[PDB]
Amino acid sequence: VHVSFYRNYGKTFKKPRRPYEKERLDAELKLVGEYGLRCKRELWRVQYALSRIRNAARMLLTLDEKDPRRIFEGEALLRRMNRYGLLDESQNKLDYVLALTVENFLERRLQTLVFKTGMAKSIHHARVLIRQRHIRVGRQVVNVASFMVRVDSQKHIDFSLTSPFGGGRPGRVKRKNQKSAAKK
Amino acid sequence: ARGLKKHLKRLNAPKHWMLDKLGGAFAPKPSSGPHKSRECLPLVIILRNRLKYALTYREVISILMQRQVMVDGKVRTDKTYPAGFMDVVTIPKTNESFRLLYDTKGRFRLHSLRDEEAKFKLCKVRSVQFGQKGIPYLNTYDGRTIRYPDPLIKANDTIKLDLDSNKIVDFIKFDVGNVVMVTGGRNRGRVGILKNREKHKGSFETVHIQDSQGHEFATRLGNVFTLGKGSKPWVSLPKGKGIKLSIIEEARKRMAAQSAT
Amino acid sequence: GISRDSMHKRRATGGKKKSWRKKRKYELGRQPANTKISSNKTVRRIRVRGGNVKWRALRLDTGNFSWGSEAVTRKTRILDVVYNASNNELVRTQTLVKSAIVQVDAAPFKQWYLQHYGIDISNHVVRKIENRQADRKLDSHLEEQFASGRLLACISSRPGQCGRADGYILEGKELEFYMKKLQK
RNA sequence: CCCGUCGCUCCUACCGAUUGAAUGAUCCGGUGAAAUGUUCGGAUCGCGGUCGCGAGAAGUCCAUUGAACCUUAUCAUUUAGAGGAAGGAGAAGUCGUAACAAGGUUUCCGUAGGUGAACCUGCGGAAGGAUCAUUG
RNA sequence: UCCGCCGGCACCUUAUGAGAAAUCAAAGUUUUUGGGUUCCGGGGGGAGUAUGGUCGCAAGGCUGAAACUUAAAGGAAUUGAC
RNA sequence: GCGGUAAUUCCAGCUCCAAUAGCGUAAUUUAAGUUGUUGCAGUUAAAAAGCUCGUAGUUGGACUUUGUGUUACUUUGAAGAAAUUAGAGUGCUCAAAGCAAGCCUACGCUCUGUAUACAUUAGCAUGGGAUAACAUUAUAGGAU
RNA sequence: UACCUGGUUGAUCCUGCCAGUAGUCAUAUGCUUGUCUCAAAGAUUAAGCCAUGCAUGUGUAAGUAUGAACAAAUAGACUGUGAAACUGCGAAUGGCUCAUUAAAUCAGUUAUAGUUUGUUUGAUGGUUACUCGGAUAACCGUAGUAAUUCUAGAGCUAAUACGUGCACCCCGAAAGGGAUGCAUUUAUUAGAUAGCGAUGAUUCAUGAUAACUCGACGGAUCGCACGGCCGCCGGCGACGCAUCAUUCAAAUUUCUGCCCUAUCAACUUUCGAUGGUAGGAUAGUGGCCUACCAUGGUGGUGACGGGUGACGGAGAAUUAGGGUUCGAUUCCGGAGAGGGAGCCUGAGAAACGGCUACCACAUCCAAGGAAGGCAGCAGGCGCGCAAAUUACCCAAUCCUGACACGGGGAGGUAGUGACAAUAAAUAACAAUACCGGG
RNA sequence: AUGACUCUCUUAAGGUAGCCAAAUGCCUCGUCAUCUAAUUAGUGACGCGCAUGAAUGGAUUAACGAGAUUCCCACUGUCCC
Ligand SMILES: [K+]
Ligand SMILES: [K+]
Ligand SMILES: [K+]
Ligand SMILES: [K+]
Ligand SMILES: [K+]
Ligand SMILES: [K+]
Ligand SMILES: [K+]
Ligand SMILES: [K+]
Ligand SMILES: [K+]
Ligand SMILES: [K+]
Ligand SMILES: [K+]
Ligand SMILES: [K+]
Ligand SMILES: [K+]
Ligand SMILES: [K+]
Ligand SMILES: [K+]
Ligand SMILES: [Mg+2]
Ligand SMILES: [Mg+2]
Ligand SMILES: [Mg+2]
Ligand SMILES: [Mg+2]
Ligand SMILES: [Mg+2]
Ligand SMILES: [Mg+2]
Ligand SMILES: [Mg+2]
Ligand SMILES: [Mg+2]
Ligand SMILES: [Mg+2]
Ligand SMILES: [Mg+2]
Ligand SMILES: [Mg+2]
Ligand SMILES: [Mg+2]
Ligand SMILES: [Mg+2]
Ligand SMILES: [Mg+2]
Ligand SMILES: [Mg+2]
Ligand SMILES: [Mg+2]
Ligand SMILES: [Mg+2]
Ligand SMILES: [Mg+2]
Ligand SMILES: [Mg+2]
Ligand SMILES: [Mg+2]
Ligand SMILES: [Mg+2]
Ligand SMILES: [Mg+2]
Ligand SMILES: [Mg+2]
Ligand SMILES: [Mg+2]
Ligand SMILES: [Mg+2]
Ligand SMILES: [Mg+2]
Ligand SMILES: [Mg+2]
Ligand SMILES: [Mg+2]
Ligand SMILES: [Mg+2]
Ligand SMILES: [Mg+2]
Ligand SMILES: [Mg+2]
Ligand SMILES: [Mg+2]
Ligand SMILES: [Mg+2]
Ligand SMILES: [Mg+2]
Ligand SMILES: [Mg+2]
Ligand SMILES: [Mg+2]
Ligand SMILES: [Mg+2]
Ligand SMILES: [Mg+2]
Ligand SMILES: [Mg+2]
Ligand SMILES: [Mg+2]
Ligand SMILES: [Mg+2]
Ligand SMILES: [Mg+2]
Ligand SMILES: [Mg+2]
Ligand SMILES: [Mg+2]
Ligand SMILES: [Mg+2]
Ligand SMILES: [Mg+2]
Ligand SMILES: [Mg+2]
Ligand SMILES: [Mg+2]
């Protein structure tokens, strides 16, 4: 026996059933370019995550509203959506969960918030800044563009202390150029 | 197999031990002793996983081999010694003394005791019968045998045992109206008042227990352990006091705690 | 060796049982003792499961026999096997098995009877002997065989298991049943 | 548009004399290792008073468990076979023209006989007919 | 001769029905799917053939494959051509 | 289906498309209401036995209180391995995961947490008695 | 995501299949491959065959030291440490594999009032002895053989080794005598009632009595500490024997449940098939076996037989629902160690990193013999479409021994690794030139 | 290679169903297979069959045979001698 055999893992996306549907290709490419995604896989996993959330809501809604499991898990699901900004305090019902869309989840990405908070000039610019260790969520540096920001953490997005854009020393390109100028 | 199994795979260990599945391929195999392997807490778990005194399997051996740990008033050096319900664990150097009691979620809790209360324990009588030479004796569910017991003591009763004199100080008859704790099954760790006893000839006897908040639950006679006569237990209970809260109620408390804390 | 398993047996329906494992040591048998009447006593110690002991008697000549009505037990010599309900061939071979009818020497019981009732079949001593003689009753059939010096007895122990041949003196309707079988 | 024989090539399967062959399993029978129990045996050793007591190997006797080998028999799987014979496939073979029109003898079903071949004929049946119709 | 009732072989009109349609007063009351029950089908061939069993005097009946082959075969209806 | 001298289909160049650190090719699920219990077909498309009888099987009219005969069914409960599945809590930088952690800055604390549901059929135990099965009834061996 | 599209015609509506579409903790293979995390890996065909190394040994203050051993000291039995060897214990767990096996294994659920159980834990063991006897290892020294943890003879000496041994009833001239611990075996007797225990239920627990057995039982053991009474008395431990309960478990066992096949309809019963009686054997129940007796037992509600490229389950894939398919493999249960069979030791094995035999393979030999079992780890050959290093370590997890310390190819670590899974680079921005829109 | 088919002479009719180197085939120890180390033998096939063939009965056939024949096992002084 190997202990590592008990480590769990799972899949995060499913490919479309119809690979060459022109309407789907047009819609997917628009989201990919709008949010600067790497490929269709990033969009597909968000859809996979959204399907899981909606599926949970549907099962709860099918139960009686007085069912203890409906009350307990229903509140937990609503609380989870609120903490990430997907829902609003005025939408505290499982029915509003079924109304969520892919755009709502893509708007909570670190890449989207960096661009829409003025820190980046373009959505694609935010992608490079995140992966280049220039952004931090609170005290922790985050280099993952897919990081889903929480409402309580959205106001703490700022440049990393070690980055040239957040008080750190200039990068090696400027430092080498300064060295070259000094030698002259 | 051709004999006795000496290993316990970690995933096969009792769930109430709360052992991480990736911590290793094996779990401590409980040694033979007063309590069953599935209803005990080995000293290695207590010293390392519960109290954090030991950081590794090796360090537990060092602590026990110094004779610094006592169970029911006697020094124990076996790492996998099966300490169980109502057992008293004493550590003179730390001046600590604990009693093994189930929390409301069915897991063993090291309930700190005062010095005065650590001089006795409660035992459930298994049976009473005549021994050799016609001498009556009774045996309990913690492996103890007591000769010349009080004639009024019968099976399923609870006896207060003094760890110093090793004699029965007092006993409680098993009857409806006493406060009992559930020591096994789904309702393990719950405390209530025995309200009814349903006997079925040739089958298990069912007992209905009502909680202090009016919640009523059933269980088998073998999973009941009387704690006191009337409504006051003879031993100190943890904070929950055997009151099982719903997940909704538990979640409500957690939400309030964050607001205050 | 000898096995007590049911694998070799046919099913209750009559179908055969295909073998799925080898013989186990915990289901073994052993050779019969075939205890015989002989003055050369021989009992061999056998080590059995759990480290316990069984005594296998190959030859025996004396036994501990009890007179039930008189509540007296005496050691006496075994003389002959006269009847066996399982197999008549065990009679001519003089095999000692449980429930076998045998003849035992009557001398040990005659001594007790004379010492107890003062009869053949000191002021205070005579006082009690006559007192016990008031309630003295002896079966005619039982008394008739005291003259020949042999008493019909039934073996109640298992010589092949305990190594001893103990029994009780036949009397009552049981004596009538067996003596009729011997009346030929 | 289309049916079958015959002729040519290839592929798959079937039948087939060879008391076919090989392989595996099982039953009965024969022989039977080893072990165990039993019987006899008493090399040898020890302990008492040149006789006793105790232990005891080789070997032997009977029985039990029973591997293994060797027959006949049965079953299973695979496989050779002169020759006989079926089906299918293979741009553009020979002979007719049976099915499609009333297909030029309406077609078809069951059954029986016959002919190079499709097919033909007898008897009863069906319309899926080429008639939903004669109180004329 | 006239009116009516039950039962039977059928026919005629009709769609509010059904169906791929022809057509059907049942072949209707079926995605608004469930009265009960038996038999039986699963692309076209190979094939009702091989083999085994069983019945028969025989003719054959009943039971009944596979290898392999093939992208159609087939049902109803429409327009042409014949 | 393309190719028989003007190839959108072959061999190439160019350009373009899909997925993308992945992608192509060679048992099984889905598609399949083409195995149909839910839920398919049998006039002509593949498919009603030539006809009737008949045992097992399967299926069986209505009626008994409304205003210690035996079972099925239903309700609730007890028991019931973990892991996996669902799911609560938790910012391993995210994630697949893991079962951790959190709190303040003392010689520490939160008794820190490590929930809960699901789990056919059979078996065990309460409540219900409509529907349904079997058994039973008039020389009452009846009740009292 | 409760979905369909191409193909039969000149065209049409159908039936119907073929093809396409998507997934697989699903294998192989092709081409390609920068980074992080995670991670399967000689199951499928051959439970085929295996060179070499390793995978099980074990020492406390507390069984046995005279190493002709070491260290430190200086008329004493020994009493600092300790190799070797005897004794004790363990090696029946773990690991590996899926061949056989279709009410069998196995699953849930029962029973043992039908049994055994080293150990742990608790309790319980009567009113020459100031300490017995004979051996043997290490050691020592004669050796044999081509040869092996192959082997013979001699001289010594220990024990917690081995063998020993202090250790109420009846008779009765009420003296005296017999029996009188515990266990073993049989018989008689009590175990009420509604002094006298328990169960749904036991002539049950247990008591008394008459005897019985040629009873591995009832301490000839060890460490530490020294005291209290005037030679006596005495502490805290270790180890060991026996009994009951308990724990760790096993064995057998109740009910229900398993894929295809009828071109398998009858099967079982001389030689056990179904049941009865009495025995034998077993830890114990039982045709488990023997003698005798009876003629039963199963079956279209599928017996019996056959097939399985069949270990069972927890589970896996896909799933609107129902369902279909898969389940060699890390958890549980079972089974096996080339094929059978037999057996010793032991609490526990029908054990195989134990033995014996046969058979099948195969190693060494001085040819007289001797030694063999990788479906443990790694590795090799073969087989194949198909699968990695003859590496390091007991630090973690836990197991085991006399044991806080030794050992552990269990297990972990690293190497190989596009089985599978997660995150995520291969550019961003500005100014020009060019090209659009508002 | 063979000749379904066609042409041609011709008979009272042109040997059909079957069967065969047969106790019936000259050629002939026919050809192929099988049995053997080796077979003019045996058996199973093939057939333009000197000269097979249907109550001058054809083709089969269980059982039977002091009938003819080939092979195998057992057995043996038949033989080695
Ligand atoms: K076992
Ligand atoms: K015609
Ligand atoms: K016609
Ligand atoms: K004709
Ligand atoms: K009418
Ligand atoms: K449906
Ligand atoms: K052992
Ligand atoms: K079970
Ligand atoms: K099963
Ligand atoms: K038995
Ligand atoms: K019997
Ligand atoms: K042992
Ligand atoms: K370790
Ligand atoms: K250790
Ligand atoms: K003749
Ligand atoms: Mg094992
Ligand atoms: Mg019970
Ligand atoms: Mg014509
Ligand atoms: Mg014509
Ligand atoms: Mg015509
Ligand atoms: Mg009409
Ligand atoms: Mg329907
Ligand atoms: Mg078909
Ligand atoms: Mg061109
Ligand atoms: Mg194309
Ligand atoms: Mg189909
Ligand atoms: Mg259909
Ligand atoms: Mg037709
Ligand atoms: Mg039809
Ligand atoms: Mg009715
Ligand atoms: Mg579907
Ligand atoms: Mg066309
Ligand atoms: Mg397909
Ligand atoms: Mg030793
Ligand atoms: Mg079978
Ligand atoms: Mg069963
Ligand atoms: Mg008794
Ligand atoms: Mg018996
Ligand atoms: Mg018999
Ligand atoms: Mg399977
Ligand atoms: Mg298999
Ligand atoms: Mg499995
Ligand atoms: Mg297999
Ligand atoms: Mg493996
Ligand atoms: Mg296993
Ligand atoms: Mg085994
Ligand atoms: Mg092998
Ligand atoms: Mg073995
Ligand atoms: Mg091995
Ligand atoms: Mg082993
Ligand atoms: Mg591979
Ligand atoms: Mg590159
Ligand atoms: Mg002819
Ligand atoms: Mg001829
Ligand atoms: Mg010839
Ligand atoms: Mg010849
Ligand atoms: Mg011939
Ligand atoms: Mg002629
Ligand atoms: Mg004629
Ligand atoms: Mg003639
Ligand atoms: Mg003939
Ligand atoms: Mg004949
Ligand atoms: Mg004749």
Give the start-to-end residue ranges of the domains of chain B. Answer: 1-116, 121-171, 174-244
- Alpha-helical segments (H) within C1-152: 89-92, 107-117, 123-133, 140-144
- C22 and C92: one domain? no
With b for 16 or more beta-carbon neighbours within 10 A and e for fewer, the B63-76 pattern comes to bbeeebbbbbeeeb
- C36 and C112: one domain? no
Write out the E strands in chain B. 8-9, 26-27, 40-42, 70-71, 74-75, 82-84, 88-91, 96-102, 108-112, 120-130, 136-140, 145-147, 158-162, 168-172, 179-182, 191-198, 206-210, 216-220, 224-228
- C58 and C100: one domain? yes
- C62 and C94: one domain? yes
Residues of B in contact with A3 (CB under 8 A): 22-25
- C101 and C43: one domain? yes
- C69 and C12: one domain? no
Task: Please give the backbone phi and psi of residue B124, each rounded to the nearest 5 degrees, phi first.
Answer: -95, 130
Structure tokens at B256: 């309030």
Q: Is C31 exposed, middle or buried (0-12, 13-18, 19+ CB in 10 A)?
A: exposed
Closest CA relative to residue A107, chosen from A96, A98, A116, A95: A116
| DSSP annotation of B47 | I
For residue B252, give the amino acid letter. R
Number of structural domains in chain A: 1
Beta strands C62-67 and C167-169: pairing type? parallel
Task: Please give the backbone phi and psi of residue B245, each rounded to the nearest 5 degrees, phi first.
Answer: -95, 145
| Cβ under 8 Å to B: A residues 71-130 | 71-72, 75-76
Report yes or no: A68 at the B interface, CB cutoff 8 Å: yes
Closest CA relative to residue A129, chosen from A141, A30, A139: A141
Q: Is A110 exposed, middle or buried (0-12, 13-18, 19+ CB in 10 A)?
A: buried
Q: By the 8 A CB rule, do B91 and B69 touch?
A: yes
Does nucleic acid strand D have an atom less than 7 angstroms from the CB of C99? no
Could you tell me the CA-to-CA distances from A99 to A55, A87, A109, B46, B216 in Å, in that order? 12, 10, 19, 50, 42
Could you tell me the CA-to-CA distances from A39 to A30, A31, A47, A139 in Å, in that order? 12, 10, 13, 30
* Contact between A75 and B22 using a beta-carbon 8 Å cutoff: no
| Cβ under 8 Å to A: B residues 66-105 | none
Neighbours of C117 (CB within 10 A): 16
Pairwise CA distance, residues C173 & C176, whole Å: 5
Please name the member of A3, A68, A75 whose beta carbon is closest to the beta carbon of B22: A3
Question: How many A from CA of B102 to the centre of ligand 29?
Answer: 76
Number of structural domains in chain C: 3
- C154 and C184: one domain? yes
Report yes or no: B177 at the A interface, CB cutoff 8 Å: no
Pairwise CA distance, residues B34 & B82, whole Å: 7
Closest CA relative to residue B105, chosen from B28, B195, B212, B182: B182
Is residue A2 a part of any domain in this protein?
no
Closest CA relative to residue B124, chosen from B16, B39, B215: B39
Q: By the 8 A CB rule, do C61 and C104 touch?
A: no
State which residues form the domain around C126.
107-149
Is residue A1 a part of any domain in this protein?
no
Could you tell me the CA-to-CA distances from C23 to B187, C17, C32, C48 in Å, in that order? 45, 14, 20, 17
- C45 and C61: one domain? yes
User: What residues does B168 pair with on adjacent strands?
Assistant: B161
Q: Which helix H or strand E contains A71, and what residues bound it?
A: helix A68-83
Pairwise CA distance, residues C8 & B243, whole Å: 58
- C127 and C96: one domain? no
Pairwise CA distance, residues C163 & C160, whole Å: 6
Is residue A65 a part of any domain in this protein?
yes
What is the structure's resolution, reported in angstroms to one decimal? 2.4
Show Cβ contacts of residue B257 under 8 Å, excluding neighbours closer than 6 positions.
none
Pairwise CA distance, residues B19 & B50, whole Å: 11
With b for 16 or more beta-carbon neighbours within 10 A and e for fewer, the B170-186 pattern comes to ebbebeeebbbbbbbee
Long-range own/partner contacts, residues A132-140 (CB < 8 A, 24 or more apart)? A133/A160, A133/A162, A133/A163, A134/A159, A134/A160, A134/A163, A134/A165, A134/A166, A135/A110, A135/A159, A135/A160, A136/A160, A136/A161, A136/A166, A137/A110
Closest CA relative to residue B82, chosen from B137, B145, B14: B14
* Measured distance between the N- and C-terminal CA atoms of chain A, rounded to whole angstroms: 67
- C44 and C64: one domain? yes
Is residue A31 a part of any domain in this protein?
yes
Q: By the 8 A CB rule, do A149 and A157 touch?
A: yes
Neighbours of B30 (CB within 10 A): 26
For residue C181, give the amino acid letter. K
* Residue B196 backbone zone (phi > 0: left; psi -120 to 50: alpha; other: beta): beta
Structure tokens at C72: 């007296």
- C62 and C9: one domain? no
Structure tokens at C49: 């499961």
User: What residues does C62 pair with on adjacent strands?
Assistant: C77
- C139 and C167: one domain? no
State which residues form the domain around A175.
19-184
- Method used to obtain the model: cryo-EM
- Residue corresponding to tokens 């056998």: C46
Residues of B in contact with A5 (CB under 8 A): none
| DSSP annotation of B55 | S
